[PDB]
Structure formats: structure tokens, C-alpha cells
């Protein structure tokens, strides 16, 4: 819920990254109003004030890959979001799969991984139930199931629950002192 959404973001924030990747998996069947994609939309930008190499990954309710990289380069305007809608795609997502495209030549700073999926919860189609084993560079990993579950789950260690994408994503910005105002500052 709202208290270990909240102390869970805290708990990564705590860990001072140096960058983060945000992984979102959206059914878009289960989005009752625009508001979603829209706070989709204003997060990512919000976050690259702080965080200008920010990565991210989309991935569909059959963990297909939708598209991935740099928030500054490819999320251009919400348009960029909301035509994922309509995007097809043949690759399986997997942690290592990200870590491998992301990171070929292997990561060198303290990554941040936020998973935050709203699909069901079926074990080899959400994100939620994948290992994110490869993050680990010795040389802050957090996931979260938007829409509450009478279900219990634990193949999945410290899953979180929370309302709605825009509580986990207002969260989220907030924590980092950043708002959607765009004022500049």
C-alpha cells in the first residue's frame, strides 16, 4: 500500500544512486482514464532534471518489449508514450536482456532499478517475477504492483503494492524534490 510504497522509494533514495532505470510494464486494458499515461509521461521527464542519463524500458502485459534507452532521447512528448499502445514487438523481456542492451560494456555506478508493473500476475509474463540478478556490480532494487492483490506472492521477495501508477509515480518524483510544474530552478 501507500505507507510501504512510500518507505520503499525512501529506502532507494536513502542509497544515493547515480543513475536510475525505470521499467514499467502497462496492460493499457486496465487504464479506466487518461490520467495514467499522462503521469507516465510527466515522471520520466521530471526525473532526467536530476537524473539526465535516466533509462527506462516499456514492456507489454506478455512481456514484450515496446521500446527502451535514454528518457532523454527517446521520450519526446506524450505521444511517445501513448503510441506504445500500438506497438508491436517480437522480443521477451528479461532483466539480463536490459543489462546486456543497456550495458554491453557492463555498469559502473550505482544503479537504481524501479519495476513497476500493473499486469496480472502470472510468473512468466510479469516483469515482477524476474531475476534481477545481473544489476548486481560490486563496484537499490524496487518492485511494484500497481492494483491490489487478494492474492499472496512470495515467488517474489519484498513485492510492494500500490494504488494507482500516479500515487507510486508522484511518489516517486517527489521523493527527489522534483514536481511537474516545469518551472525551472
Same mark, same amino acid.
Given at each position: 500500500?501507500? /505507507? &510501504? &510504497?512510500?518507505?520503499?522509494?525512501?529506502?532507494?533514495?536513502?542509497?544515493?544512486?547515480?543513475?536510475?532505470?525505470?521499467?514499467?510494464?502497462? *496492460?493499457?486494458?486496465? /487504464?479506466?482514464?487518461?490520467?495514467?499515461?499522462?503521469?507516465?509521461?510527466?515522471?520520466?521527464?521530471? /526525473?532526467? #532534471?536530476?537524473?539526465?542519463? $535516466?533509462?527506462? !524500458?516499456?514492456?507489454?502485459?506478455?512481456?514484450?518489449? =515496446? *521500446?527502451?534507452?535514454?528518457?532523454?532521447?527517446?521520450? %519526446?512528448?506524450?505521444?511517445?508514450? +501513448?503510441?506504445?499502445?500500438?506497438?508491436?514487438?517480437?522480443?521477451?523481456?528479461?532483466? #539480463?536482456? $536490459?543489462?546486456?542492451?543497456?550495458?554491453?560494456?557492463?555498469?559502473?555506478?550505482? =544503479?537504481?532499478?524501479?519495476?513497476?508493473?500493473?499486469?496480472?500476475?502470472?510468473?512468466?509474463? +510479469? #516483469?515482477?517475477?524476474?531475476?534481477?540478478?545481473?544489476? &548486481?556490480?560490486?563496484?537499490?532494487? =524496487?518492485? #511494484?504492483?500497481?492494483?491490489?492483490?487478494?492474492? %499472496?506472492?512470495?515467488?517474489?521477495?519484498?513485492?510492494?503494492?500500490?494504488?494507482?501508477?500516479?500515487?507510486? /509515480?508522484?511518489?516517486? !518524483?517527489?521523493?527527489?524534490?522534483?514536481?511537474?510544474?516545469?518551472? %525551472? %530552478?
Amino acid at each position: 500500500g501507500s /505507507l &510501504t &510504497t512510500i518507505s520503499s522509494i525512501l529506502s532507494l533514495k536513502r542509497e544515493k544512486p547515480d543513475n536510475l532505470a525505470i521499467i514499467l510494464q502497462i *496492460d493499457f486494458t486496465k /487504464l479506466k482514464e487518461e490520467d495514467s499515461l499522462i503521469v507516465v509521461y510527466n515522471s520520466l521527464k521530471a /526525473l532526467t #532534471i536530476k537524473f539526465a542519463r $535516466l533509462q527506462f !524500458c516499456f514492456v507489454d502485459r506478455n512481456n514484450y518489449v =515496446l *521500446d527502451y534507452g535514454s528518457v532523454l532521447h527517446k521520450i %519526446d512528448s506524450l505521444d511517445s508514450i +501513448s503510441n506504445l499502445k500500438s506497438k508491436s514487438s517480437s522480443t521477451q523481456f528479461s532483466p #539480463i536482456w $536490459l543489462k546486456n542492451t543497456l550495458y554491453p560494456e557492463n555498469i559502473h555506478e550505482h =544503479l537504481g532499478i524501479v519495476a513497476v508493473s500493473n499486469s496480472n500476475m502470472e510468473a512468466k509474463k +510479469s #516483469i515482477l517475477f524476474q531475476d534481477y540478478r545481473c544489476f &548486481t556490480s560490486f563496484g537499490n532494487e =524496487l518492485k #511494484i504492483k500497481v492494483g491490489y492483490l487478494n492474492v %499472496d506472492y512470495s515467488k517474489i521477495d519484498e513485492l510492494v503494492e500500490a494504488s494507482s501508477w500516479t500515487f507510486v /509515480l508522484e511518489t516517486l !518524483c517527489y521523493s527527489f524534490g522534483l514536481s511537474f510544474d516545469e518551472h %525551472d %530552478d
